[PDB]
């Protein structure tokens, strides 16, 4: 449907996000995920810090190197979450995950593009108010992720330069509205508006 789809992770539930993205891949749709630090997980912080440490101890006894790798960074947690839902060992497996990209923050290109959300994975829409959840930035750093401060730094910076972007944009349409009204009541307007436009 599109060349590439950018998803503003913030407020998306790890597994449910995983599930849709996975499929979109296999159906031939590229997806680049942003802001995985702001990704949510059901259940409060401690439960998902437990679960993670549970994961931590599984390792090849005779050689901790040649067995399970434990990645920390939110993106790479989200990739584990996702890859486990792709027949990833197959040719078709590697095929799908070539198209996929996961990111902390919003770097070049994608920060100039637009990003979408997945209502069937948005936490606010899905979780019941009352229940507690975890943010992937916090979970990651509390198991040794290294870059919580630097990301938050660069996104503080980003959010300023895009407000500047927005500020000017919204202004220019106040004109474009002001234009689209001096041409209201005109003959072409009524005709158009009589055709549902």
Partner RNA sequence: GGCCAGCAUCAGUUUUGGUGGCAGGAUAAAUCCAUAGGAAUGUAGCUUGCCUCGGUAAGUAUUAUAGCCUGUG
Partner RNA sequence: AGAACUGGCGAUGCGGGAUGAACCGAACGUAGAGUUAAGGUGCCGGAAUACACGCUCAUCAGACACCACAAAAGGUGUUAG
Partner RNA sequence: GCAGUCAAGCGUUCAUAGCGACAUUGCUUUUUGAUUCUUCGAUGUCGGCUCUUCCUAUCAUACCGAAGCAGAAUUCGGUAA
Partner RNA sequence: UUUGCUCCACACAAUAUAGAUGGAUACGAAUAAGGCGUCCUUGUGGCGUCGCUGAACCAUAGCAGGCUAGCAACGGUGCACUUGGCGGAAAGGCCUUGGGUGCUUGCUGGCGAAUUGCAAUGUCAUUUUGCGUGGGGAUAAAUCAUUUGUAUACGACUUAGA
Six token digits for residue 193: 């508006």
Contact at 8 Å (CB) between 67 and 6? no
- Size, binding site for RNA by CB under 7 A: 69
Identify which range of 18-26, 65-73, 134-142 contacts RNA by CB under 7 A.
18-26
Task: Give the residue with the Cβ less far from other proteins, 71 or 133.
Answer: 133
Nearer to other proteins, 163 or 179 (CB): 179
Q: Does 72 contact RNA by CB under 7 A? A: no
Q: Toward other proteins, which CB reaches closer, 108 or 196?
A: 196
Query: Tokens standing for 107?
Result: 């770097």
**Pair 77, 14: CB distance under 8 Å:** yes
Dist. CA 51–CA 56, nearest whole Å: 9
Q: Which residues pair with 6 in a beta bridge?
A: 32
Choosing from 4, 50, 56, 116, the residue that interacts with other proteins (CB under 8 A) is 116
109-148 core/surface letters (b: 16 or more CB in 10 A; e: else)? ebbeeebeebeebbbeeeeeeeeebbbbbbbbbbbebebb
The DSSP bridge pattern shows strands 40-42 and 100-102 to be unpaired
CB of 130 to other proteins, least distance (A): 7
β-pairing, 40-42 with 5-8? Answer: unpaired
* Residue 91 C-beta: closest distance to other proteins, Å: 26
Q: What tokens were used for 183?
A: 């041409």
Residues in contact with other proteins by CB under 8 A are 5, 7, 20, 24, 61-65, 114, 116-120, 122, 124-125, 129-130, 175-176, 179-180, 182-183, 186, 188-189, 191-192, 195-197
Residues in contact with RNA by CB under 7 A are 2-4, 6, 8, 10-11, 15-16, 18-20, 22-23, 26, 28, 30, 32, 43-44, 46-47, 50, 61, 84-87, 91-92, 95, 98-99, 103-114, 119-122, 124, 128-129, 131, 151, 154-155, 157-159, 161-163, 165-166, 169-171, 174, 197
């Amino acid at each position: 449907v599109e060349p590439v789809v950018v998803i503003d992770g913030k407020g998306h539930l790890v597994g449910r996000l995983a599930s849709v993205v996975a499929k979109q891949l296999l159906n031939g749709q590229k997806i680049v995920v942003v802001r995985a630090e702001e990704l949510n997980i059901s259940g409060e912080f401690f439960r998902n810090k437990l679960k993670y440490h549970d994961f931590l101890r599984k390792a090849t006894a005779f050689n901790k190197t040649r067995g399970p790798f434990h990645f920390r960074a939110p993106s790479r947690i989200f990739y584990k979450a996702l890859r486990g839902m792709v027949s990833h060992k197959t040719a078709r497996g590697k095929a799908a995950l070539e198209r996929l990209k996961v990111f902390e923050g919003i770097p070049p290109p994608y920060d100039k593009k637009k990003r979408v959300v997945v209502p069937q994975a948005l936490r606010v829409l899905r979780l019941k108010p009352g229940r507690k959840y975890t943010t992937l930035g916090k979970l990651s750093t509390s198991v040794g992720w290294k870059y919580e401060d630097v990301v938050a730094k660069l996104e503080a910076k980003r959010k300023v330069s895009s407000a500047e972007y927005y500020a000017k944009k919204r202004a220019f349409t106040k004109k474009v509205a002001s234009a689209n009204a001096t041409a209201a009541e005109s003959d072409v307007a009524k005709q158009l508006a009589a055709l549902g436009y």
